[PDB]
Design a protein around this ligand. Sequence first.
Ligand SMILES: Oc1ccc([C@@H]2Oc3ccc(O)cc3[C@@H]3CC(F)(F)C[C@@H]32)cc1
Ligand SMILES: Oc1ccc([C@@H]2Oc3ccc(O)cc3[C@@H]3CC(F)(F)C[C@@H]32)cc1
Lengths: 235, 211
Amino acid sequence: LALSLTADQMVSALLDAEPPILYSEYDPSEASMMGLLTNLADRELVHMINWAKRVPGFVDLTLHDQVHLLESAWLEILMIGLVWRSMEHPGKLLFAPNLLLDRNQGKSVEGMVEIFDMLLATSSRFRMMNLQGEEFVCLKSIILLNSGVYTFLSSTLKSLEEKDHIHRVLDKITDTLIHLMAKAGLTLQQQHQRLAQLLLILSHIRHMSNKGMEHLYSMVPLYDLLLEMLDAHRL
Amino acid sequence: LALSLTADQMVSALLDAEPPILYSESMMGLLTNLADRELVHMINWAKRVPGFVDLTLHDQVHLLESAWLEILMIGLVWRSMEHPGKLLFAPNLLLDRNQGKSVEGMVEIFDMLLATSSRFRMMNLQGEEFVCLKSIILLNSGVYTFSTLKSLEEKDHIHRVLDKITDTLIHLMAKAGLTLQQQHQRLAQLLLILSHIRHMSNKGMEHLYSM
Ligand SMILES: Oc1ccc([C@@H]2Oc3ccc(O)cc3[C@@H]3CC(F)(F)C[C@@H]32)cc1
Ligand SMILES: Oc1ccc([C@@H]2Oc3ccc(O)cc3[C@@H]3CC(F)(F)C[C@@H]32)cc1
């Protein structure tokens, strides 16, 4: 059904599915800075799952594939969200309304400053491009559907069907982006130049996620933890 | 400047800059040796990429340091298209999945490379499109991690050249006879694959580093 949605409907649904902005939890002695960060991410994860289900076409996939996509994309989704809310805070990262950190504070945290700077640069880029909220939610949906699609275990009929569907929805979101741009008044040439610029940023977002993984790895398996939350009962 | 070249001139310039396919001369030794010799050639190819030499020396170095493994990998995946289930590291070094199990932590990357190659096969990726994507990788990968006056000029240059390569890719597709819708969708599909390639490179770097 998600494939019958119009651009405007696609956009509406995504806007409607946006997760809440959470707060860091502390008494303004129980955790370090990185603890505040991981705790925050843990809580957002729960909500990310609710968002994912509301993304057109996601719930049509098997439980296995849904989990695989999220396990592959969760840090990219958190990061693009952080970059989006950091846009109006040059030099700073709004991890939470009560956890606005600047570059110097990311040094306190062993080996996080590289990622910090990359996240800052991405935020500047978004600002510089006049990234619209509508384009932002499309991008986040593309990350969710595209990040793990290239690494699906089996290659059985069911899996092939799944990949066909994922790609169809991805082409859909592509049309929605082009549509928005056409509406904003861009020329065809300007439309494809901007689509390209936007999609190229996701490559840097993937890179930042990988470096975040390492940093996190350095210091229950997420698949089972995700599965647990995605696999709900109807009681 | 590169910024004045037409779509056909860009294509022509990229095709002509194409590096040669090298031959393998115990596995990692052969793979690393092959990679090491390809790097000499990659650098020359890079200097032929329109716009690239206009950048400072430090920035050229920065872009190559950042993109070199992705560039090797997309080359690898391209010459492996017509060999489903196999990775053609060199015409005399064509390996399968089972052969990757040999080395620790290689199979996972192998499988990703194989999946990427299959994707290119399924999309019927053309060589004109391939040289554009490879050039996009070179100019895009490290640009995000170069706030000075010079930095502004550099990123502006890179982004204008990228817009040029984008017009070139769309042009190619237009001639191919795709509808506007099909061009946009195909451009997107190709660019989204670049993120998977970035991912393989990072895992490839972790691998190298552990040895
Ligand atoms: O909504 C968000 C909530 C938290 C974050 C944080 O981002 C960074 C960035 C650099 C770094 O070195 C560590 C982290 C931690 C570790 C984590 F759990 F992976 C993600 C955390 C990001 C978005
Ligand atoms: O043109 C090419 C020449 C060589 C390759 C190899 O690809 C892989 C793939 C998986 C892996 O685990 C190791 C490697 C080695 C290590 C390296 F130096 F990074 C690149 C090498 C690829 C393309």
